[PDB]
Design a protein around this ligand. Structure first.
Ligand SMILES: Cc1ncc(C[n+]2csc(CCOP(=O)(O)OP(=O)(O)O)c2C)c(N)n1
Ligand SMILES: Cc1ncc(C[n+]2csc(CCOP(=O)(O)OP(=O)(O)O)c2C)c(N)n1
Ligand SMILES: [Mg+2]
Ligand SMILES: [Mg+2]
Lengths: 788, 788
């Protein structure tokens, strides 16, 4: 009889819901006198009110009913919260369960604890107004709307017994990212993955406008969610006495369907995509607060958002209304004399680790197991001569990722936006295929690698693809994101949200265990100009992640395949960083051996001895490169200069870890002044080729002593369509432009390099003319290799 | 008998479709011998193949059938293209119509012209592989997928007789932005707006993966689009003989419904939201190219994306197959001896301006009419004393925008992501309300401002909101975007796409008339930290738009309301810029009179005489500010310094136009070296308060002579929750931190300013302690005003 509830246990559910609402109101308003033992006075109210109330009753209404199902059916849920500004509702229920008392002993379950509990919310030196990392049992910050549903599916990607209850605000459902995330049920395998129970909180209003989904007809709303692949169940009303029975019955039915779906799939008798149940709530906005305030409707309206009454200190009448509002929950029968919840409320709280706020899944770092990585030197290419052998850069990486999948069959996934094949990572398909969970045709088997049990996630929407990965990591698993650099601006907002989550969890919150790292691989960079991607690519994503501190983000630009393996191997072991790896899929030169590449990545930046002209003497110029396309151009320029000026001494420096340039004061990761002055001399000119905007190097190396002698070339603009070398000429990162820049900077070459500079300009013109006539570069340009 | 088509006219339609397909293949592959008069040889094939073929037959199939309806029903369409990489299909049909010959006389309709026509595509010194601005009759670039449907609705926002046929690739429909854009039919008013006929090109595959929408059941697909508010019609098959009849019948029926919908709405007898017709195409991908190539299925598969055969010069067998492919269209009966389309094809082309490629709507600058702007000096606040009066900053702007709406009732709209009321722009509601076109309840009137004829567009999603505006501008109308700075990262990718469109159209394309400017207003900046927005706001959007050159983007940071009006007035007259206006909604000080604000905006950066300490003497320090919150702190610091050091001489410089700092060499807009050295002295230290990342100032003013003496304070990081003054202290942009920095930099104060520096530090500590105890700043901090 799970569907029906006894009248007495409905009272306990109702009492819990009132208590949660009372604590929600207290946090927003009160600063002292939590239990209204003495009459409310203006010194008890917070001066600045920033909390949100409109969505709080709805979140608490769902939370109390989910707790009922946990006690009876012994489930485990995590309750990903969409609105995010309904943080008071989550904290209030966590406090009642006892989770908040355990995590924060200061906010004890007593009258003194309540005063501290109310005081801290939305207060300086206290918790924030959203679901920040300080919130127990929270994986989604919720401040930026649209990513709640994708996070729900990410947390359920490999937890077969987990059920994720994601509450979505209708205002959030208008956003782009969330509209696609509904389709993510077609990538969820019932046999080996958990279930997501999305609940659409259709209160009917945003801050100031009716929501789109509330104002479409009931038939259209039902048809919309059937099209998404769900089976919608509607819970509508405004009377708690009726809604308690309806909500309990509907939730019980939905969970039975979810268990029925999983049981059939795991038995192997029904391997077909099911209609996942879904719940729609039509509760009024703020449907327990004041009805009218200033002659306007406040309950179930857009005015219920955040604070119904902002002016309470000034207006004594409003303060009386606020006091009447608190009394409406009848706190005298909810808390005992000491200030703790009465025995009635304690009896219906989940016990121990079953509590949604205390679920270990939310604090995923506790469940994180280190990846069993194979030795990457077994996939490294062979380079008997550096700079003379040619091989495909991403083929070794695909093989390495294939091995990682084999040895980590449950806690590793590969995320790629329909470009894993385009990125030349087909080696991963030799063991596992892409997960589809949809209908299949015979032509798919020949062409594509599709199966229900697939460790590679593919969908064009990079918003939901990024959402899956972030939730996957915060749950304690590992993953690798491989995409194009042209489309990195799409996930720009999501990376910022994840970046601030890691930063806060690392420093401010001490009970948050370290989660795995967010590894992003960007291929097909701006310079090659592949067939895919728009004409005007942009390396601006590298700039936007540098705004985040070096304590949370790392950027790597490996020059060849072996260095890519070392970077990939190292970054699969890190914990609390956003690693951005900029590689290129085209067949390039190979410079570093397996052992040499490993040492190079350990230093992050080093001098290439085979390319450097003279050791044991002071260099005349330091030529540095960061990317891998620009690395070839820098080497080609070095070959030209050494051929035309035999006595010129050149030191070649290649930098892989971009944040090594920052001084040691900014971060312990950066190079010290002595170490930096050793690589880049204190007085000789530095010619720096860089994949990306040339100014990013100036920002990092601004505090250095020799910054005034640093000359950076890099991406400026791209024409409509160009050959690989013509594009380099336009941005002046070409081999000839690099050689010309060296001649200008070196003092003793200004008079002696006049003849060579003229010849170099002729080469620039000659190659451009050939490009226009033939559309391709000369054969000796594509087949260039280190001559010394 | 529009539905049925005569057998003879079906032959003409088929002949046109074959001709369009033949030209599509020629552009991708051929470089000479366009009509295959001589046998195909490897010297005729392009060396590098970058064109896309998979989507080309589908686009041409729709295009030829739309042209049939234009001739018969005298419609006018624009054919917004979603795939974008199907550029060859658009150019081929433009060539056949004659539009391409007229716009580009070099590519004449002859054998010589065809050779030039094929040669230029995807070739250096030629057109690109996407729908760049060079493409006749194109408003959407299509390179970044997901924005096609929003652009279709933007183009029809005020053209009552226009019908927009938007073709959407199924892979694009997976993206987040496009999933929301389906709901934009609920903001389109049938009475006064055009219609959008979205066509879903469901070929079943992307580059390497089956598409999500193709693999859901037919019933789910139908239910999904009924939920979006459309009435889906399915056109399925692979035999052109049958599809020609079915496609013609379906298109004719859909247009009759669209005309029936508009006629009923304009008659006033049915003011209800209708079910807009929509079409789903299930044609195979590349369903006229080769069937098998290397033992794999190539037609109607993911291998048909871009080029079916990449190795043609190397493999003689593939070249044979390519030659057989071209012959399959039978070019001998499509082009005459001279190389022009036969009289049969010419007879079915639309005449003159009815051609979709020649429609003036696509080249919106031709239809652009200047906005009738009222004198902004009638909405200006009064400031008898600068820096002493306090007034709301956005209230005058809302009144000004209300006047603009009244005098421009047809070609001006205001776009706001459900924050116009929160942004304190309710003055606009005094004349026109928000457009809803959905069901309404009585509570809606009493509170919100909703009506079918509304000039304010409000949807929570910012991808579709930005998409509407960009299409609105490119169609020749005007608009104003008002949003929060915290959510500017969402429209990050869309702005870059619009930025490159304006840049290419301004320089490369000469027949593109100048469209109106994209005016973006960012309110509720990071410093105030209002209730809305996540805790960790970011001013990074300002940095990203600076990566674009100053020739396409402008950034303004007005300090008060009157300067905000002048900036808004000026930027409503500009044409080809992306104007970013960073204001703040909170009640601030007012510094500039209506006349003074006008002069200040004309110069872009000037010396405030009332705040400057001593004229006629060399300043000891130049204090500069950019934003408006930091402007108050800079003024407060000046008041402290002038109070404690009477003999200190301070020059106060306020900069509104950010790009004025760039040297005149970078752009003619920037200040000359003499002008810059006049404002900021050549040798005295400069203390620069900046709203945003402090390094952006260094990037702009790097080439200046006095850059080494420039010290920028700005946004660094934000705590979980802070008061307005505590946040400034953390970032050291506070008045006390500013005063301390001045004491350090000024050489003759480092000894005399020891006592004052200690007192300033005490003030910092004292205010922080009060904030922690009370949660609010001291009254004398909020009520500060210029004392001199
Ligand atoms: C993309 C985006 N647009 C706007 C906002 C501003 N915002 C913060 S909370 C909120 C309300 C969202 O409404 P809904 O999801 O219905 O929430 P509820 O009514 O349950 O509070 C809005 C618009 C945002 N955070 N992100
Ligand atoms: C957001 C985004 N993801 C991925 C890409 C890369 N891309 C460009 S075209 C394409 C194929 C998808 O095209 P589809 O919509 O299926 O069109 P059709 O071939 O049916 O015309 C892809 C993945 C992109 N440009 N933008
Ligand atoms: Mg809501
Ligand atoms: Mg497709």
């Amino acid at each position: 009889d799970i569907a029906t509830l006894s009248p007495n246990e409905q009272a306990a559910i109702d009492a819990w819901w009132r208590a949660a609402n009372y604590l929600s109101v207290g946090q927003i308003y009160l600063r002292d006198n939590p239990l209204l033992q003495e009459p409310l006075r203006p010194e008890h109210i917070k001066q600045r009110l920033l909390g949100h109330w409109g969505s709080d009753p709805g979140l608490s209404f769902v939370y109390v009913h989910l707790n009922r199902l946990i006690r009876r059916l012994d489930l485990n849920l995590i309750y990903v919260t969409g609105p995010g500004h309904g943080a008071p509702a989550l904290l209030a229920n966590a406090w009642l369960e006892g989770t908040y008392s355990e995590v924060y002993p200061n906010c004890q379950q007593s009258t003194a604890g309540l005063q501290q509990f109310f005081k801290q919310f939305s207060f300086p030196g206290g918790i924030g107004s959203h679901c920040t990392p300080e919130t127990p049992g929270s994986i989604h910050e919720g401040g930026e709307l649209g990513y709640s549903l994708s996070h729900a599916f990410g947390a359920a990607l490999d937890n077969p017994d987990l059920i994720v209850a994601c509450v979505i605000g209708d205002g959030e459902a208008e956003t782009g990212p969330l509209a696609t995330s509904w389709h993510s049920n077609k990538f969820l395998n019932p046999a080996q993955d958990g279930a997501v129970l999305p609940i659409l909180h259709l209160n009917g209003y945003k801050i100031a406008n009716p929501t789109l989904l509330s104002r479409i007809s009931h038939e259209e709303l039902r048809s919309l969610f059937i099209g998404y692949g769900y089976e919608p169940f509607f819970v509508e009303g405004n009377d708690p006495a009726i809604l308690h029975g309806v909500m309990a019955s509907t939730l019980a039915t939905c969970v039975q369907k979810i268990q029925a779906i999983q049981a059939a799939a795991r038995s192997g008798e029904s391997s077909d995509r099911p209609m996942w149940p879904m719940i729609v709530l039509r509760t009024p906005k703020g449907w327990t607060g004041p009805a009218t305030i200033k002659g306007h409707v406040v309950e179930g309206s857009w005015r219920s958002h955040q604070v119904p009454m902002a002016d309470v200190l000034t207006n004594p009448e409003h303060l009386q209304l606020l006091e009447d509002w608190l009394r409406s929950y009848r706190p005298e029968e909810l808390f005992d004399a000491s200030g703790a919840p009465v025995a009635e409320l304690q009896a219906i709280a989940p016990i121990g680790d079953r509590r949604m706020s205390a679920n270990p899944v939310t604090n995923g770092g506790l469940l994180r197991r280190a990846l069993t990585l194979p030795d990457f030197r077994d996939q490294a290419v062979s380079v008997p001569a550096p700079g003379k052998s040619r091989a495909d850069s991403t083929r070794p990486l695909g093989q390495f990722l294939r091995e990682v999948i084999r040895h980590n069959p449950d806690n590793f996934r590969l995320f790629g936006p329909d470009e894993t094949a385009s990125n030349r990572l087909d080696a991963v398909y030799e063991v596992t295929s892409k997960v589809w969970l949809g209908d299949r045709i015979p032509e798919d088997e020949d062409g594509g690698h599709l199966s229900d049990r697939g460790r590679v996630m593919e969908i064009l929407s990079e918003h939901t693809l990024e959402g899956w990965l972030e939730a996957y990591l915060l749950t304690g698993r590992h993953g690798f994101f491989a995409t194009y650099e042209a489309f990195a601006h799409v996930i720009d907002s999501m990376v910022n949200q994840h970046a601030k989550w890691l930063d806060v969890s690392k420093r401010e919150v001490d009970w948050r265990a370290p989660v795995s790292s967010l590894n992003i691989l960007l291929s097909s960079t701006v310079w090659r100009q592949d067939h895919n991607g728009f004409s005007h690519q942009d390396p601006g994503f590298i700039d936007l992640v540098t705004n985040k501190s070096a304590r949370v983000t790392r950027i790597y630009l490996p020059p060849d395949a072996n260095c890519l393996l070392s970077v990939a191997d190292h970054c699969l072991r890190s914990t609390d960083y956003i690693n951005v790896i900029v590689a290129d899929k085209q067949s390039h030169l190979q410079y570093l051996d397996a052992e040499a590449a490993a040492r190079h990545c350990a230093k992050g930046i080093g001098i290439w001895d085979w390319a450097s002209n003279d050791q044991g003497a002071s260099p005349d110029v330091v030529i540095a490169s960061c990317g891998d396309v620009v690395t070839l151009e820098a080497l080609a320029a070095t070959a030209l200069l050494r051929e035309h000026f035999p006595d010129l001494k050149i030191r070649f420096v290649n930098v892989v870890d971009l944040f090594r340039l920052q001084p040691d004061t900014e971060h312990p990761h950066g190079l010290s002044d002595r170490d930096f002055d050793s690589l880049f001399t204190v007085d000789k000119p530095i010619i720096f080729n860089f994949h990306g905007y040339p100014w990013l190097i100036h920002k990092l190396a601004y505090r250095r002593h020799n910054h005034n002698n640093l000359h950076v070339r890099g991406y400026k603009e791209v024409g409509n369509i160009n050959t690989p070398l013509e594009l380099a000429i336009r941005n002046q990162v070409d081999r000839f432009n690099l050689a010309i820049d060296v001649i200008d900077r070196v003092p003793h070459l200004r008079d002696r390099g006049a003849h060579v500079k003229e010849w170099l300009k002729d080469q620039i013109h000659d190659h451009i003319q050939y490009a226009y006539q033939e559309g391709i570069d000369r054969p000796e340009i594509n087949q260039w290799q280190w001559p010394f």
